[PDB]
C-alpha cells in the first residue's frame, strides 16, 4: 500500500520562565518512532519503535545534533517574528513545522511537504512543485525573500526526492512485521434507549490500523450525514485506533438503518445492522 514519513516540531516561548520548550516527533504512517524534548533530563533523540533501535550510535549522534540545532534556530526565529509582527516581549508564542514524503506501493515519490505556522496560523509553505513558496502575509514574505535568495527550496527538493524516500524504504523493510500490516476494525452495533419514543444506534469500529477509516449510517439506503454523530478517530494506546457513529432512530424503525465500514484491512466494505 501507500506510506509516509513525517517529522513534527513545536517550539513554545515562556517569557520569564527560561528558554522556549522544544519538542519534535517522527512518524511512519501512524506509527511514532523517534522523539526529542529539550526539557528532558539529558536531551537526546530517543527510539520509540522496535525497528529503529538497530540504528547505530552515529545515527543517534547525528539526529541529536540536528534536533539541538532546530531548537536553537527556533529560539532565534521566535525573536525574529516578534519584530516582523511588531509584538511585545511579554507573551507566549508558538512556532510549528512539518515536513515529509509520501510514496506509492512501488516506493516512488508521490508528494513532498515542508510548511510552517506561527501562533497556529499558516505562515509559509513550500508548494507541491517543491520549487516555489506560498506566504500567508507580508511578514512571511520577508522570510520568502530570504529563502528565495538562499535557494532553500532547491535544498528541500533534493532532500524530499532523495534521502526522505530512501529512509522511508529502509524503515518499511526493517519494520515490515508491523509497518506493512493493516489491522481491520472489529465492528458491532449497540442500541441505547433515550425515551419510549427513540433510541440511539451506535456503530463501533475497534482495534484497527492504520487510522484512516470511513463509517456511515444509511436509512432505507440513503446517507444520513446530517443526522449522524461522528466522533474523531482516537488512539487506543496499543498502536490501534477506535471510532463510532451514532444516529437517533424512532422506536421500531431499527431495521431501516444500516452501518457501512470501509478500511484498508477489509477486502470488501462491510454492512451491519442492529441485532436484537
Amino acid at each position: 500500500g501507500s506510506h509516509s514519513m513525517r517529522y513534527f516540531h513545536t517550539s513554545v516561548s515562556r517569557p520569564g520562565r527560561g528558554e522556549p520548550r522544544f519538542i519534535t516527533v517522527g512518524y511512519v504512517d501512524d506509527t511514532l518512532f523517534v522523539r526529542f524534548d529539550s526539557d528532558a533530563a539529558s536531551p537526546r533523540e530517543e527510539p520509540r519503535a522496535p525497528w529503529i533501535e538497530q540504528e547505530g550510535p552515529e545515527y543517534w549522534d547525528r539526529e541529536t545534533q540536528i534536533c539541538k540545532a532546530k531548537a536553537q534556530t527556533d529560539r532565534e526565529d521566535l525573536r525574529t517574528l516578534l519584530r516582523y509582527y511588531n509584538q511585545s516581549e511579554a507573551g507566549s508564542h508558538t512556532l510549528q513545522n512539518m515536513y515529509g514524503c509520501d510514496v506509492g506501493p512501488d516506493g516512488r515519490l508521490l508528494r513532498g511537504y515542508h510548511q510552517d505556522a506561527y501562533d497556529g496560523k499558516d505562515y509559509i509553505a513550500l508548494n507541491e512543485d517543491l520549487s516555489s513558496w506560498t506566504a500567508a502575509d507580508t511578514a512571511a514574505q520577508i522570510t520568502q525573500r530570504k529563502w528565495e535568495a538562499a535557494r532553500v527550496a532547491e535544498q528541500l527538493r533534493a532532500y524530499l526526492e532523495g534521502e526522505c524516500v530512501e529512509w522511508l524504504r529502509r524503515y518499511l523493510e526493517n519494520g515490515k512485521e508491523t509497518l506493512q500490516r493493516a489491522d481491520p476494525p472489529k465492528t458491532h452495533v449497540t442500541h441505547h434507549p433515550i425515551s419510549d419514543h427513540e433510541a440511539t444506534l451506535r456503530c463501533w469500529a475497534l482495534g484497527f490500523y492504520p487510522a484512516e477509516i470511513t463509517l456511515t449510517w444509511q436509512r432505507d439506503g440513503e446517507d444520513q450525514t446530517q443526522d449522524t454523530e461522528l466522533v474523531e478517530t482516537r488512539p487506543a494506546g496499543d498502536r490501534t485506533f477506535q471510532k463510532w457513529a451514532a444516529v437517533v432512530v424512532p422506536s421500531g424503525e431499527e431495521q431501516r438503518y444500516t452501518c457501512h465500514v470501509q478500511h484498508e484491512g477489509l477486502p470488501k466494505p462491510l454492512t451491519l445492522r442492529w441485532e436484537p
Binding site: 513545536t10 522523539r35 507573551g91 497556529g120 496560523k121 441505547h192 475497534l206 474523531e232
Partner: protein
C-alpha cells in the same frame, strides 16, 4: 490572539469488563495554544502517576495529547477526566461512560 478549545474523549482501551484490568484514556484534541492541564479522576479524586504522550499536531495545526493510566473497572467506581485550558473559564469534567 485566535484560540481553539479542546475536544475531549474519555474511554477505555478494551471493552469494559468488571474486575478485569484495562487502561483508562483521555484524548484531548483540536486545541491551541498547546499548554493544557489534564487529570484523570477516580471517585472525584485525582489519580497519581498518570502518563501522557509527546506533544504533536494535526494537518490544521491544532494540538493533540493522550493521558492514560491502568485501571480495573467495577460497578460502583466512577471515572472522569478533568481539563483546564486558556479557553475554559473553568475546568471541564467529562465522565467515563462505558457506552461511549
Amino acid at each position: 490572539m485566535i484560540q481553539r478549545t479542546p475536544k475531549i474523549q474519555v474511554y477505555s482501551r478494551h471493552p469494559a469488563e468488571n474486575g478485569k484490568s484495562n487502561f483508562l484514556n483521555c484524548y484531548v484534541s483540536g486545541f491551541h495554544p498547546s499548554d493544557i492541564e489534564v487529570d484523570l479522576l477516580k471517585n472525584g479524586e485525582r489519580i497519581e502517576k498518570v502518563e501522557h504522550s509527546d506533544l504533536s499536531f494535526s494537518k490544521d495545526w491544532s494540538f493533540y495529547l493522550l493521558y492514560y493510566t491502568e485501571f480495573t473497572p467495577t460497578e460502583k467506581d466512577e471515572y472522569a477526566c478533568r481539563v483546564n485550558h486558556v479557553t475554559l473559564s473553568q475546568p471541564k469534567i467529562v465522565k467515563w461512560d462505558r457506552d461511549m
